Amino acid sequence: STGSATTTPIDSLDDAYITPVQIGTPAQTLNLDFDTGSSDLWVFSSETTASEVDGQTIYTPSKSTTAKLLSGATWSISYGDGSSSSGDVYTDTVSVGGLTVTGQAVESAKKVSSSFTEDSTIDGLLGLAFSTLNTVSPTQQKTFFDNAKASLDSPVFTADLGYHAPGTYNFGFIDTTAYTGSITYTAVSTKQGFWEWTSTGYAVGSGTFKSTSIDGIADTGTTLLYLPATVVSAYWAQVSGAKSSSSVGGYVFPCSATLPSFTFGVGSARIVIPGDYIDFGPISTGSSSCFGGIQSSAGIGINIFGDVALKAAFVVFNGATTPTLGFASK
Ligand SMILES: Cn1cccc1CNCCc1c[nH]c2ccccc12
Numbered sequence: 001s002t003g004s005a006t007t008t009p010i011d012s013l014d015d016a017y018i019t020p021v022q023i024g025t026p027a028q029t030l031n032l033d034f035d036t037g038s039s040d041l042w043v044f045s046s047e048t049t050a051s052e053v054d055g056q057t058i059y060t061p062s063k064s065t066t067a068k069l070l071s072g073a074t075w076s077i078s079y080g081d082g083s084s085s086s087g088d089v090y091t092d093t094v095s096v097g098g099l100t101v102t103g104q105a106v107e108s109a110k111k112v113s114s115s116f117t118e119d120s121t122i123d124g125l126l127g128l129a130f131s132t133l134n135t136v137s138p139t140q141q142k143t144f145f146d147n148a149k150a151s152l153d154s155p156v157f158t159a160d161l162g163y164h165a166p167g168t169y170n171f172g173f174i175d176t177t178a179y180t181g182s183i184t185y186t187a188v189s190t191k192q193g194f195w196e197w198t199s200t201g202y203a204v205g206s207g208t209f210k211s212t213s214i215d216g217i218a219d220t221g222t223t224l225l226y227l228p229a230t231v232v233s234a235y236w237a238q239v240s241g242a243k244s245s246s247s248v249g250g251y252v253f254p255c256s257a258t259l260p261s262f263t264f265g266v267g268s269a270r271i272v273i274p275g276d277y278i279d280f281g282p283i284s285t286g287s288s289s290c291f292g293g294i295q296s297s298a299g300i301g302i303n304i305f306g307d308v309a310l311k312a313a314f315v316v317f318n319g320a321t322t323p324t325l326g327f328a329s330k
Pocket of ligand 1: 248
C-alpha cells in the first residue's frame with residue numbers, strides 16, 4: 001500500500017503545516033500537524049475542556065462505530081516549546097492520503113495548553129518519530145507509520161514541505177519526480193527516539209563551506225533551524241544590524257535586509273536554504289524588527305533541523321530495520 005496527502009502552511013509565515021487525516025467511521029476529518037519530533041497522535045475531541053477549544057475541529061469517538069476506549073490508558077506530553085496536552089485513549093481507524101491503519105491509538109485530549117487553544121488551525125498532532133517516545137501509559141502505543149509499515153510497498157515516508165505553498169507527505173514510496181539530482185542518505189541514531197543525524201557542515205551565503213559535524217534531529221514539527229551558537233553567530237554577522245535580543249528571545253534583523261542563504265551538508269552533498277526562507281517577519285505588527293529563522297540551540301540541548309531547513313529539501317524518512325535519512329534538492 002501507499003498514501004499521499006497534501007500538507008498546507010497554517011499561515012503566511014509557514015509557522016507549521018497541517019495535513020487532513022480521516023479518523024473513525026464514518027470518517028471525521030481533522031487537520032493534524034505531522035511531527036517527526038514526537039510519537040503521539042492526539043486530537044482535540046468531545047472530551048477537551050470546553051474553555052480550551054477555540055475553533056478547532058474535534059473528534060467525537062461516540063459518533064464512530066469503530067472507536068473503542070483503550071481501557072485504563074492515559075497520555076501526557078510536553079513539547080520543546082513548553083506546550084503540553086494530555087488525556088485518554090481510543091483505538092480507531094485512521095487514514096492518511098488513502099493509506100488506512102486499523103486499531104490506531106488516537107489520543108483524545110482532555111487538556112491542552114494555551115498555544116494549542118490559540119492555534120485554531122491545528123486540530124492535533126500526528127507523531128512520526130520512533131514509537132519509543134510515545135507517552136501512553138501503562139501500555140506504550142505505536143505511531144501511525146509503525147503500524148502501517150508492514151503493509152507499505154517500501155518502509156518509508158517522505159516530507160516535501162513548501163515555501164509559502166502546499167507540499168506533500170507520501171507513505172510507502174519515493175516520488176522520483178519530486179526532487180532534482182540524487183538523494184543522499186545519511187546514518188540515523190534512534191537512541192533518543194528521534195530521527196537524529198549528523199550534518200557535515202555549513203556555509204553562509206557565498207562563503208566557503210566549513211566542514212564540521214553537527215548532530216541534530218530532523219523535525220517537521222518545529223518551525224525554525226536551531227544550531228550551535230558559533231554557527232548562528234557566523235550567519236547573523238553577515239546581516240547588517242542583526243542582533244540577539246534577550247527581550248524578544250533570539251536573533252532579530254532589520255526588516256529592510258536582504259538575507260544570505262544558508263547551506264548545510266549531508267555527506268558530500270549540500271542543501272541550500274534561500275535567504276527568504278529565513279525571514280519570519282515583524283516581531284509584532286508594524287515593527288521594522290524581523291525575527292530570524294536560524295536561532296541558537298544553546299539551552300535546548302539538541303540541534304534541530306526544523307521546517308526552515310527541511311522545506312529546502314525532499315526528505316526521506318527510511319524506516320527500514322536500520323533507519324536512515326535521505327535529502328535531495330528540489
Ligand atoms: C519566536 N517568536 C518571536 C516573536 C514571536 C514569536 C513566536 N511566533 C509563534 C508563531 C506561531 C504561531 N502558531 C504557531 C504554531 C507552531 C509554531 C509556531 C507558531
